[PDB]
Design a protein around this nucleic acid. Structure first.
Length: 75
RNA sequence: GGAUUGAAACGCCAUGCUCAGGCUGGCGAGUGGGCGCCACUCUCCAA
């Protein structure tokens, strides 16, 4: 059940979803490290819709962005 | 029930492969070769 159909960025791209109750399976780049550079983190609506950025590095097919609520990120 | 750099967003309207041209002219299956050599219807049964 859902409030509305999810989308992959644009409404014309519906997304199928499922809930997991197990371990994360292996992935294509599980054994690789790859750099992506800076990318968007989130938008600050309080600061009249001001964006934020962070440095992204993909390793072992997992990503760990910093906390977007942290004040030091807001700086 | 606020906010997926998001919420809305036609590649669309229409146009002849057309007009026409001889597979033709002509060439001998033709020359010639024995079915031959020879062989008993024959032995006996009154009207």
């Amino acid at each position: 059940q859902s409030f509305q159909q999810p989308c992959l960025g644009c409404r014309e791209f519906p997304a199928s979803f499922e809930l997991l109750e197990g371990d994360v399976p292996l992935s294509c780049y599980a054994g690789e490290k790859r750099d992506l550079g800076y990318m968007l983190l989130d938008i600050d609506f309080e600061r009249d819709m001001t964006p934020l950025f962070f440095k992204a590095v993909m390793e072992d097919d997992v990503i760990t962005p910093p906390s977007r609520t942290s004040p030091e990120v807001r700086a």
